[PDB]
Amino acid sequence: KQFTLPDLLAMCPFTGSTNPHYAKAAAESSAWVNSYNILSDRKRAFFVTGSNELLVSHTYPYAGYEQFRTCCDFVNLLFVVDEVSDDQNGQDARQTGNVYLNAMRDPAWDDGSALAKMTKEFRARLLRYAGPGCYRRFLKHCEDYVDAVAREAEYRERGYVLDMASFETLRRENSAIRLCFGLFEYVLGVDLPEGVFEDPVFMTLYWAAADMVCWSNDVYSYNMEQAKGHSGNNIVTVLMRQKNVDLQTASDLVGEHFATLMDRFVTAKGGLPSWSPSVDAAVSDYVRAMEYWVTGNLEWSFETQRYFGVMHAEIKYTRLISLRER
Ligand SMILES: [Mg+2]
Ligand SMILES: [Mg+2]
Ligand SMILES: [Mg+2]
Ligand SMILES: [Mg+2]
Numbered sequence: 128k129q130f131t132l133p134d135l136l137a138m139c140p141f142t143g144s145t146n147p148h149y150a151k152a153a154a155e156s157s158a159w160v161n162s163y164n165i166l167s168d169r170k171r172a173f174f175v176t177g178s179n180e181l182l183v184s185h186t187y188p189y190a191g192y193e194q195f196r197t198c199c200d201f202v203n204l205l206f207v208v209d210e211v212s213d214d215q216n217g218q219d220a221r222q223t224g225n226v227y228l229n230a231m232r233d234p235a236w237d238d239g240s241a242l243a244k245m246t247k248e249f250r251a252r253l254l255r256y257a258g259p260g261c262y263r264r265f266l267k268h269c270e271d272y273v274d275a276v277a278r279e280a281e282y283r284e285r286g287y288v289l290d291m292a293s294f295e296t297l298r299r300e301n302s303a304i305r306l307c308f309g310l311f312e313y314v315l316g317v318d319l320p321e322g323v324f325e326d327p328v329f330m331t332l333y334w335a336a337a338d339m340v341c342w343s344n345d346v347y348s349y350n351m352e353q354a355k356g357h358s359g360n361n362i363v364t365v366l367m368r369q370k371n372v373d374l375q376t377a378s379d380l381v382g383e384h385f386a387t388l389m390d391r392f393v394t395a396k397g398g399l400p401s402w403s404p405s406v407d408a409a410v411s412d413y414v415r416a417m418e419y420w421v422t423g424n425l426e427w428s429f430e431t432q433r434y435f436g437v438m439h440a441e442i443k444y445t446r447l448i449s450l451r452e453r
Contacts, residue, residue: 128449129449131447132442134382144185144189146183156179157179160200160245164241165245178430180199180203182202186307190314194310217280217284220276220280226238253310253313256316258313261310275297275300289365299334299337304337311417320406323406340424349363351434
């Protein structure tokens with residue numbers, strides 16, 4: 128019937144912010160993405176009502192105009208890929224992701240579609256400034272994202288629900304959070320040393336914030352996803368199945384895991400090595416950028432209509448979810 132969300136904002140010690148360029152870059156980005164005909168009229172109606180750019184405002188509130196607009200275009204592009212592939216079988220979703228992937232990776236490749244052209248335009252923005260390290264890893268993130276979205280579609284169409292360990296590997300990639308973290312070096316204007324990405328403390332912070340985003344998105348989006356038969360790619364479903372618990376308990380377990388990840392993130396922050404004044408300053412800005420993503424994703428979730436409907440503002444305070452019919 129109903130359940131209550133875990134109180135994730137109460138567990139978040141970070142102070143959220145928004146981007147002052149939101150009004151102008153969002154109008155530009157929304158006009159850009161809507162210049163393409165790719166979604167059904169019903170999907171369009173929800174898409175243009177989802178406040179996609181507001182998510183970017185909350186999660187990259189420090190971005191300068193140029194970089195912020197690029198992030199808006201990118202998140203709008205991801206939402207397009209997501210909503211198109213949601214309505215597709217496994218082979219069609221794999222082809223959709225491969226349009227994005229080839230357009231990103233191969234400067235010659237353009238199959239003529241609206242999605243290819245959209246990807247090429249974001250790509251040209253990214254490549255104005257992105258460093259060789261950031262871009263090389265971004266393309267690797269692109270391939271992992273596409274493979275995970277395609278496999279999500281295959282498993283959805285077959286009814287297969289992954290075991291929790293396999294689910295987390297897949298969800299980390301098909302949530303696109305690694306792509307979004309992958310723009311930090313672009314937004315901040317500087318590549319991190321490749322050695323930083325295999326520091327054990329930095330890896331701990333990276334994965335704790337990525338998982339916080341994944342698990343909080345899952346418990347928030349569960350209602351809308353189960354109502355459209357999409358609940359297989361969701362930790363709530365995985366927990367009910369494999370731990371044999373009911374919905375409120377799975378919700379409670381999301382909250383316990385979120386608190387564990389947040390504690391690990393905050394306690395790990397202090398153990399960060401020091402490499403040099405300039406590297407340390409850049410690393411610190413990257414770590415603050417993960418904090419803004421964790422906090423901004425939470426805040427946006429209660430500002431958009433995407434997960435909670437038109438009464439989303441009230442749900443922020445009651446956390447009471449009534450399950451939607453099919
Ligand atoms: Mg989705
Ligand atoms: Mg996502
Ligand atoms: Mg979701
Ligand atoms: Mg999905």
